[PDB]
């Protein structure tokens with residue numbers, strides 16, 4: 001029953017979830033004073049991201065975001081263990097303020113943000129298990145700006161009217177998940193942080209791509225108006241809007257960049 | 262009890278200070294989407310700010326910031342009620358990231374921020390009593406950026422070495438506090454918000470001046486490096502740095518401006 005607004009919003013999460021008050025918290029503002037080029041940040045390789053269109057993947061409204069489950073044959077290579085996909089999901093603002101990314105860059109929000117969550121499959125049986133373990137999770141973040149219509153993102157957004165309420169599930173045909181990543185994936189920011197939602201475990205290796213992708217105002221409006229945090233039958237409905245955490249103090253941490261300029 | 266760093270950090274203030282998780286929380290990002298000109302916002306008059314240089318004013322390190330006590334004959338004229346001064350203090354970052362203002366403008370931090378705290382002395386007997394009441398407090402905020410040396414800020418900063426550790430105090434001779442305000446104080450942002458420190462009571466009328474002041478790079482480094490959060494005999498000393506709150510969500514609300 002944590003939320004992003006009101007008595008149970010983010011400044012209260014630590015009452016029930018201690019790690020949300022702990023160190024290494026995400027998201028953060030990416031700005032020059034805390035950036036440092038690291039030449040060892042070589043390009044990631046995205047394996048098994050081309051999901052078959054004849055197969056289907058479960059989309060669920062979990063009351064906090066909408067998530068698409070991903071198969072464990074989908075992996076990122078380049079890290080010092082292989083990390084296998086578990087789910088992707090989004091964070092966004094609202095129709096009157098389409099500025100709901102979690103990470104900011106030099107103090108500016110982007111319209112939305114996509115997270116593709118992976119767990120260390122070398123060392124762990126599943127994501128739940130990896131989630132409280134050192135080195136356990138790797139999340140890829142794509143910053144989303146308002147711009148051109150994006151047919152790849154529409155492969156997810158076209159199914160939102162079927163997961164409007166908490167607990168609802170729908171199937172999305174497979175598509176190539178790499179189509180959701182931006183240009184020049186070799187350029188990214190990398191840092192040690194946390195889940196941006198309760199329980200806020202400080203166990204995530206973040207990669208935020210330097211370049212945003214674009215989706216249209218109509219696509220953002222659909223995302224911002226389609227979904228509810230509450231069940232279909234709840235007499236106290238709550239729109240699922242502004243589901244991003246404020247940026248966190250950078251307790252002496254640097255962010256490492258694969259790009260020098 | 263509470264700190265700006267670590268386990269007792271701002272995300273955990275709401276356990277012991279429930280208003281830290283409530284409504285109307287400050288500080289906020291001031292950005293053009295939420296700005297609205299309001300002609301009712303006339304210039305404030307700063308009365309009694311020219312402090313007798315024959316009086317001394319106590320400077321304290323309280324483990325959270327450095328604060329100067331101010332006399333209640335010092336007040337703002339221009340609001341509904343008279344608001345009388347109680348103290349001023351500052352918030353800053355650290356030398357590796359010297360951007361520690363509380364408010365932000367179009368998503369940008371300034372180097373530091375000075376707050377001159379006042380309380381409604383028409384309605385209440387002192388600031389302690391006003392701090393949790395309707396209309397209780399008014400704070401003036403001055404954004405600070407690095408630039409020219411500022412002699413007026415140096416009337417405070419030259420005493421910092423005598424308040425290095427928590428609980429230390431020094432005496433500061435009266436000077437004209439208006440010298441700490443920026444150019445064109447008629448230009449400001451105004452909104453209802455809260456204390457930015459526990460107990461975070463939503464009882465502050467904010468006035469954030471549009472224009473920043475400048476202090477030199479040496480002045481700013483002095484403020485970032487002179488002080489500790491800890492007592493002198495603490496075997497584990499903590500530097501006093503990054504003593505600002507993160508910006509709060511501020512949705513379906515306006516900040517009013519005295520300028521268009």
Ligand SMILES: NS(=O)(=O)c1c(F)c(F)c(S(=O)(=O)CCO)c(N[C@H](c2ccccc2)[C@@H](O)c2ccccc2)c1F
Pocket residue numbers: 062064065066067086087089115117118119127128129131137139194195196197198199
């Ligand atoms: N933004 S974030 O990337 O930091 C994030 C979220 F924003 C987010 F909304 C979720 S959520 O599952 O979609 C709804 C809130 O739990 C998860 N889901 C968690 C998760 C999924 C897969 C693998 C690890 C973690 C979460 O539900 C969870 C937490 C702890 C243990 C198991 C699962 C998550 F990681």
Ligand SMILES: NS(=O)(=O)c1c(F)c(F)c(S(=O)(=O)CCO)c(N[C@H](c2ccccc2)[C@@H](O)c2ccccc2)c1F
Pocket residue numbers: 323325326327328347348350351376378379388389392398400455456457458459460465
């Ligand atoms: N940053 S702020 O402008 O919003 C603010 C105020 F608005 C404010 F009114 C005060 S206060 O005058 O001391 C409250 C009356 O006791 C403090 N002082 C803090 C405080 C003490 C007791 C009760 C409430 C708040 C004190 O903790 C402090 C002093 C200096 C710098 C940071 C914190 C303060 F930080």
Ligand SMILES: [Zn+2]
Pocket residue numbers: 089090091115196
């Ligand atoms: Zn996320």
Ligand SMILES: [Zn+2]
Pocket residue numbers: 350351352376457
């Ligand atoms: Zn203050």
